[PDB]
Amino acid sequence: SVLTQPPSVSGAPGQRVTISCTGSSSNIGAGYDVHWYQQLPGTAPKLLIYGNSNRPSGVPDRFSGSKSGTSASLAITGLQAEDEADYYCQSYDSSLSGSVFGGGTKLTVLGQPKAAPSVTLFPPSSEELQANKATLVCLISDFYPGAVTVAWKADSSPVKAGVETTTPSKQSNNKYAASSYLSLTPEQWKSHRSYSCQVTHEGSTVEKTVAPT
Amino acid sequence: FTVEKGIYQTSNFRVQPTESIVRFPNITNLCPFGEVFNATRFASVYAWNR
Numbered sequence A: 001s002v003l004t005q006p007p008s009v010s011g012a013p014g015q016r017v018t019i020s021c022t023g024s025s026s027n028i029g030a031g032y033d034v035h036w037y038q039q040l041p042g043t044a045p046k047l048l049i050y051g052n053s054n055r056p057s058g059v060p061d062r063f064s065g066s067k068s069g070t071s072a073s074l075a076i077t078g079l080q081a082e083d084e085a086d087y088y089c090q091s092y093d094s095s096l097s098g099s100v101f102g103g104g105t106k107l108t109v110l111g112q113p114k115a116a117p118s119v120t121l122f123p124p125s126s127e128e129l130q131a132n133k134a135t136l137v138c139l140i141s142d143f144y145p146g147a148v149t150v151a152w153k154a155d156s157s158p159v160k161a162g163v164e165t166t167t168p169s170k171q172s173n174n175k176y177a178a179s180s181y182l183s184l185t186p187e188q189w190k191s192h193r194s195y196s197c198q199v200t201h202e203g204s205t206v207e208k209t210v211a212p213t
Numbered sequence B: 001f002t003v004e005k006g007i008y009q010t011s012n013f014r015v016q017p018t019e020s021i022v023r024f025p026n027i028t029n030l031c032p033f034g035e036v037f038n039a040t041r042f043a044s045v046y047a048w049n050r
């Protein structure tokens, strides 16, 4: 809205990373103090620094807050193993008659190497045919990272309806697994000759097909 | 001290203006500031709008 933030910022583990926050002349440039918060994906945000002059208890001294007139800046020294969150600007807005937050910056560069994926295609069982639906599942497991595109074909034309893709989650041995469903009906399931799922990972494309008859 | 008949040019006539107008525009622009007073609700005295 009234506060704009960059989408992402790049840095190195050992140099200085500085973020710039720009607003208006009635919320931050009027004279109001600014507050910075960290939005960890899964935990409630906490207070980092208020007023850019005092240090709250439990907060390290590596975080520095300054207000260069209409713009506020935050600087850090060294990238540790907990900076994988979002930084926001909080200031009182007279026009909005309340507190308004910023956009949010993501702090990550690269932590995902490559691996070799493996897929499995399982046709629906006999009890699924009488439910007036056909859920075609093509599971993908043991791959890294979790960025796989899913394409469905019926050996004559690609299927662009009912295609879904779930987000992958970390396995026990630091890998990723995913599944893809396809909503169909048993009326046309038997008419088609075969069904398959096609995926591509870093140029490696594998294909598995099943025959209902 | 003796002037004969004829035409004679003595000085020059200059019409000095008495008033000056220097107004360049007809009106100047404005900025949105009436919303400070024309508002649905106001703030309090411990935390007022700046």
Ligand SMILES: *[C@@H]1O[C@H](CO)[C@@H](O)[C@H](O)[C@H]1NC(C)=O
Pocket: B034, B037, B038
């Ligand atoms: C506020 O609203 C009134 C009526 O809508 C209008 O006459 C006036 O010019 C506006 N601005 C101020 C500063 O009062």
